RNA sequence: AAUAAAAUAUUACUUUGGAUAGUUUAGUUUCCUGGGCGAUGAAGAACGCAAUGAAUUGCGAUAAGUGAUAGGAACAAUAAAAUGUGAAUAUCCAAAAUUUGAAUGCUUGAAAGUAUACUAAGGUAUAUAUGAUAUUCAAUAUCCA
């Protein structure tokens, strides 16, 4: 599966990717939106606090039936959750993208999560047995996750 | 009044999905030649057989093949062994051809079985109906001593 975007300078970027990951797309789509643009060190700390329910992931688009929380103040979103499984899956991709950067020879402290994208994947079907002799579907919602870490520098064009 | 988180709109890239284009060892129809099955056991069914096979294909206790005749150097997924002193391959031929099935000694459900005769095992034959011939008979049915 190809990447949504290519780095501006491949010499100063690192990539990680996962395909058909067995994690919910709607939860991971909100976790990736939270960590997009922050430094790699901060993004690793934020995802660890989501795990122990100390920073919230604001559910901005998929907020149907989600409850309100005290950590959702100032984010322009009244709803949030702490998706642990999607935080752990992104953490394994963030790590893999850092040893890829270390192998290249980039300063890890200067990296940032420039591009992270979540895509839908083919669902797996199961059986749920309903009343009056019916059978419904019990479908997973896997996803693809891309990740590009690029170094940061000041931009000036005269 | 204000924010653009959600919402909406366009383009590029990616994804879910498999339309479109190109293609065809498959079909459909018409015509030509035959229309060549079986008690010498058919069609159908079952089971079994490959060095590593489950299906399918081929084959039948001589098993993915035997002989003969043509044929001339391969097979392969891997390893063997054989091979111009003849490998693949082909056949209206020869041998061989498990259990059934018209199924036919008797029984048969998913049944394992079993009788007699001929030639301990193994192999043959013994259903019903029927034509011809031979042989043994039955009925005073007609004569008849």
* DSSP string computed for A111-129: EEEEEEEEEE-PPPP-EEE
Helix H or strand E segment including A81: strand A80-81
| Cβ of residue A158 lies below 7 Å from strand B | no
Rounded to an integer, what distance in angstroms lies between the CA atom of residue A66 and that of residue A8? 38
| Cβ of residue A76 lies below 7 Å from strand B | yes
Q: Which residues contact A20 (CB under 8 A, 6 or more apart)?
A: A121, A122, A142, A144
Nucleotides of B under 7 A from a protein CB: 3, 5-7, 13-17
Task: Give Cα separations from A43 to A36, A64, A111 (angstroms).
Answer: 8, 26, 11
**What one-character DSSP code corresponds to residue A74?**
T
Structure determined via: cryo-EM
How many helices and strands, by DSSP H and E, does chain A display?
3, 7
What count of other Cβ atoms lies within 10 Å of the Cβ of residue A88?
Answer: 14
Task: Give Cα separations from A73 to A15, A55, A77, A78, A116 (angstroms).
Answer: 33, 11, 7, 7, 24
Say which residue the tokens 């901005």 belong to. Answer: A60
Residue A50 zone, left/alpha/beta (φ > 0; ψ -120 to 50; rest): alpha
Q: What is the resolution of this structure in A?
A: 2.8
């Amino acid at each position: 599966v190809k990447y949504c975007a290519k780095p501006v300078n491949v010499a100063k970027a690192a990539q990680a990717r996962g395909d058909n990951l067995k994690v919910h797309f709607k939860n991971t789509y909100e976790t990736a939106d939270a960590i997009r643009g922050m430094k790699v060190a901060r993004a690793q700390e934020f995802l660890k606090n989501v795990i122990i329910k100390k920073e919230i992931v604001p559910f901005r688009k998929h907020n149907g039936g989600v409850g309100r929380k005290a950590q959702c103040k100032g984010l322009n979103c009244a709803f949030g959750r702490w998706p642990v499984k999607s935080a752990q899956f992104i953490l394994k991709l963030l790590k893999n993208a850092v040893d890829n950067a270390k192998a290249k020879g980039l300063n890890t402290a200067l990296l940032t999560v420039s591009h992270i994208a979540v895509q839908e994947a083919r669902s797996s079907r199961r059986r749920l047995y309903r009343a009056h002799g019916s059978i419904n579907s019990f479908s997973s919602s896997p996803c693809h996750i891309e990740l590009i870490l690029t170094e940061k520098e000041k931009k000036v064009a005269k």
